[PDB]
Amino acid sequence: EEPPLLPGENIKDMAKDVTYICPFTGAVRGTLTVTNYRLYFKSMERDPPFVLDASLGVINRVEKIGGASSRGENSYGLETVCKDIRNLRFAHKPEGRTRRSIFENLMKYAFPVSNNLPLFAFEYKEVFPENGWKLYDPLLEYRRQGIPNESWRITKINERYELCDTYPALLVVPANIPDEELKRVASFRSRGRIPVLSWIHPESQATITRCSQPMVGVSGKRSKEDEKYLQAIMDSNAQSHKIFIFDARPSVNAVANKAKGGGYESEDAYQNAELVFLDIHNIHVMRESLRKLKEIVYPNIEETHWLSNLESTHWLEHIKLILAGALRIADKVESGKTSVVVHSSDGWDRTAQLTSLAMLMLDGYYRTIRGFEVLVEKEWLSFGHRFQLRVGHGDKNHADADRSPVFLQFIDCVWQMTRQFPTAFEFNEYFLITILDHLYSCLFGTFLCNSEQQRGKENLPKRTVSLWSYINSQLEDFTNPLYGSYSNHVLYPVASMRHLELWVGYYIRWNPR
Amino acid sequence: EEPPLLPGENIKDMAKDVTYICPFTGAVRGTLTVTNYRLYFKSMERDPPFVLDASLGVINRVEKIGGASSRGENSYGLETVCKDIRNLRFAHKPEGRTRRSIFENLMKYAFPVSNNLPLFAFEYKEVFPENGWKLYDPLLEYRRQGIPNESWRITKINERYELCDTYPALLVVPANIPDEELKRVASFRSRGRIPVLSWIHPESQATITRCSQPMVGVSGKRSKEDEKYLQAIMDSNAQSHKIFIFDARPSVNAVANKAKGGGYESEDAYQNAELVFLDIHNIHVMRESLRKLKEIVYPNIEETHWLSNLESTHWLEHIKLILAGALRIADKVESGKTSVVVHSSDGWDRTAQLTSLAMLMLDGYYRTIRGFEVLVEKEWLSFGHRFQLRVGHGDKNHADADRSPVFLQFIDCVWQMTRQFPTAFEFNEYFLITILDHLYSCLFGTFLCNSEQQRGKENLPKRTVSLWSYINSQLEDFTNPLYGSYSNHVLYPVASMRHLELWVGYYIRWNPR
Question: Which helix (H) or strand (E) holds B340?
Fold first, then answer.
């Protein structure tokens, strides 16, 4: 059957009497359509119409199955490997070009930028009553936190992104540190990500700052600017006697980075700091972890070795390390009243997961729907997470090792927190799954590019629809009705294999049971 | 401090200033009291009075630590291995006229059966608003099921236990089958446990009968009355097409028995019967499962390999098979409208788990607190599960290979069902745990002996108190607040490693969470 279209979506090819092999109900013949935004398959050979509708941004690779003409053993079709742990395999008649027409159209529209075609986000013409692009206001958010205040000021040194071009235009830093000082410190921090304020505690004034690793190198070089800058941070919390520095990386990996120019803060160079390593592994390791998981989760789960197979993926283990690390940060801020500086190698994948999760534990604001969108806009988009590079929108280059489920891990961690606190979040599971779906969809421009400055040059607000514009128009589908019972208090989920669950709602949502 | 003694409980020994080394908190000195029913330890050295109550009946083994020459920090004293997945270690003064005393008095009252001392069950003299021994009435129960009737009659042939000394005094058998033949059939079934009615469906008249394995042997011999027996059970159902015989043993097993004089019902000899194997292992295989489970759970849990270690015990795998097995039987009765016959080697272990479990699925009556109690008294107690032998009340022989957690296993399954159906049961977790607690406590006579006949020869109903007499006094602590939500209908739990959980409430309840 025909697929429903969206403002800007037009059919690019169609083939009828195509057979999709469902690993759960068997073969089903019907029509396969490929618009400039999705892959649609519907069959009227089933009482409820069997509809398969997946966006093209989800397609990771396309592969042919069988060979040429009809040499294959009853298998002339193609298969699509999807980012959301499905794989879709289709069959084609002996007599038919539909096998090559579809393949060639998928391998063109599912990968627009690799064929100098535009991503759908730029074609989508649907309008909304609210502009998601105007949801996050740096100045208003800081004000919500009490910023500018005697201890912290707001600098505009980065409005044209000269200090650091992967950072937001506005940066909050200690009031006693001048702009000429930020330059020097920027010379010591990788890619100019010089610690900057993320969150400040209402009462204690304890702060969460984020930045990249120090450039120490093998010769063990050091800078007074950076060292005093870190001190200025601790001085802004008056009643504290220390400053913790959480390094997301495992100790053995930080050392390796040191050998290549990076490193960490030593107990001697930073007198009043205590650096902890949280043992959270790099992007490549998480890609492999998720890959092993998809392997035992789709399409059929083998019961006997489920537990060991699951453990072997190290998915839940990584989630646990992320949550636990977030827990250590939020605790030192809450209970210890001590400011914490959090970083990693570049400070834009693990640091983002840590600050984001701690913030959610500490501030109930980000647990509300609009709050979370702000959280996503603040930590991850504005602070330079490479969504484009990490997801690979419309790029045939599926093996790229720059691709990793970083954000997906974060969202998983959030879902983990919502299970443990069924009343503390205004949003619900569907909201989160909807976010993961549009991470790949490229329907909106919210998860495009790799930086704030990039999005400015690309003029994304004026050329694409924000994902929040659509979500804030259907809020009845994203609200947790049990939201309230808890309160405007601090959350402390339990990181332990006995309280973390596999997010069945996402990683196994295709099995019709 | 001293223990709060129960009606009939006397202090057999006391020593003060003893050290308890808690595998979770530090050492605690205090007073270790021993009575004729429990082991009580209490210390006022902790904001919350650290209490350590435990029935002697839950003491699996007592062994002395140190004696010759060992003066260290808590390396002198005694240790107790318990049956409720924990271990107690007391550092009791090396000198002070207390070199040898506490140990001796623990040993004496912890194993009354071996020492030839009364079980505290006979010295307990608390009274309760109702007597649990009256709770279950064989005739009042069959009447609830609509028995007797045109098709099934109640025979008295075994009133003196002369047909089967394990079996209850009243037996429900096919109306047409006279008592004389019950004898001939009794000689074909192992230990004379002839197929007897356990449950019947109100609408389809599909029954569920239980028995021990057939006595076929290598000589493939067969009973003319047996076959005819099963024929009447089928004929009672309106002659429905055919009749399933569920053997709880794996195929290999039944065959093993065959060569031993036992076996199972063959095609041609039982022409109208489908024989299925549920692949549930024997007592030794189970005890070993539970043994590996207490080793990775107590005292400290190694997180890195929790999933693997848990998979290695195969506890969840056995719970699956057992539940899975009840699902088939329940389904063949609910859906196929077919009478089934469940049996095993002796027909008092796996048969009890299966009928009890299927019955819970089919009849909501057993889902009520009183109904469940009746279930235990009927399917487990009157039908001869060897709780004295399987649990070994007050017996110094801990290596006995006759001991197996067959009943606990059953209770574990039920807990699984209260988890998958949080509203269908009137009783709550605590209730089920209390039941496990008095399985070892021997505070009541409810779980003593091996059969109904023995319990009578000891006159338990008049010399000991029934557990239900206690439980039904506080039904507010044992009630499920959510119960009622659903209707009286058939519960179908999922028997998958993806749905079953590890009862942390009973297998890891000691840790301070």
Answer: strand B340-344
Residue A3 lies in a domain: no
Tell whether B322 is covered by a domain: yes
Q: Cβ distance B355 to B246 under 8 Å?
A: no
The DSSP 8-state label assigned to residue A2 in this structure reads: P
Residues A297, A439: one domain? yes
Per the CB < 8 Å rule, is A498 touching B317? no
Smallest Cβ–Cβ distance between B307 and the set A303, A307, A504 belongs to A307
- Provide the residue range defining the domain that includes A407: 111-147+281-338+347-509
Residue of chain A whose Cα is closest to the Cα of B307: A307
Q: Is residue B1 part of a domain?
A: no
Q: Which of these three, B346, B366, B398, is where a domain ends? A: B346
Beta-carbon-side half-sphere exposure of residue A357 (alpha carbons within 13 Å): 35
Residues from chain A contacting residue B497 (CB–CB below 8 Å): 303-304, 306-307
Query: Could you tell me if B168 and B265 lie in one domain?
Result: yes
Residue by residue, DSSP assigns A448-475 as -SSSHHHHHHTTHHHHS--HHHHHTTSG
Look up residue A395 and give its two tokens: 């790029």
Best CA proximity match to B472, nearest among B370, B379, B372, B377: B370
Whole-angstrom distance, CA of residue B413 vs CA of residue B436: 13
Distance from CA of A303 to the nearest CA of B (A): 6
Where a domain ends, among B315, B346, B377? B346
Joined together, the tokens standing for residue B119 give 């079980």
Q: Contact, B278 vs B341, CB < 8 A?
A: no
Residue B405 CA to residue B386 CA, distance in Å, equals: 11
Residue B494, φ and ψ in degrees, nearest 5: -95, 130
Q: Tell me the residues of chain B between 482 and 501 that have a Cβ less than 8 Å away from chain A.
A: 496-498
Instruction: List the one residue out of A3, A20, A15, A12 whose CA is nearest residue A79.
Output: A20
Task: Kindly state whether residues B359 and B219 are assigned to the same domain.
Answer: no
Mutating which of B297, B298, B301, B308 best tests the A interface, going by the most A Cβ atoms within 10 A?
A: B308
Residues of B (276-315) whose Cβ lies below 8 Å from A? 301, 303-308, 310-311
SS3 A173: strand
- C-alpha pair distances (Å), B53 with each of B12, B18, B58, B80: 15, 15, 11, 13
**Which of B302, B311, B513 best tests the A interface by mutation, with the highest count of A CBs <10 A?**
B311
Site from A293, A298, A302, A308 to mutate, B interface, most B CB atoms within 10 angstroms? A308
Using an 8 Å Cβ cutoff, are A280 and A350 in contact? yes
Whether residue A305 sits in one domain with residue A221: no
Search chain B and give the residue with CA nearest A305.
Answer: B311
Q: What is the DSSP letter of B116?
A: T
**Among chain A residues, CA nearest to B504:** A498
Distances (CA, A) of A328 to A61, A411, A413: 39, 19, 15
CA nearest neighbour of A222 among A266, A255, A274, A272: A266
Q: N- to C-terminal Cα distance for chain B?
A: 25
**Vertex A197, ends A191 and A199: CA angle to 5°?**
135
Distance CA B493, CA A353 (A): 38
**CA atoms lying within 13 Å on the CB side of residue B350:** 31
Search chain B and give the residue with CA nearest A303. B497
- Please indicate, yes or no, whether residues A90 and A115 belong to a single structural domain of this protein: no
- Residue A4 in domain: no
Q: Both tokens of residue B308? A: 């693997």
A328 with A468, same domain: the answer is yes
Determine whether the interchain pair A306/B497 forms a contact, defined as Cβ–Cβ distance below 8 Å: yes
Tokens 């074609």 locate to A123
Q: Give the total number of structural domains in chain A.
A: 3
Residues A102 and A177 in one domain: no
Query: What's B51's domain CATH number?
Result: 2.30.29.30
Residues B328 and B424 in one domain: yes
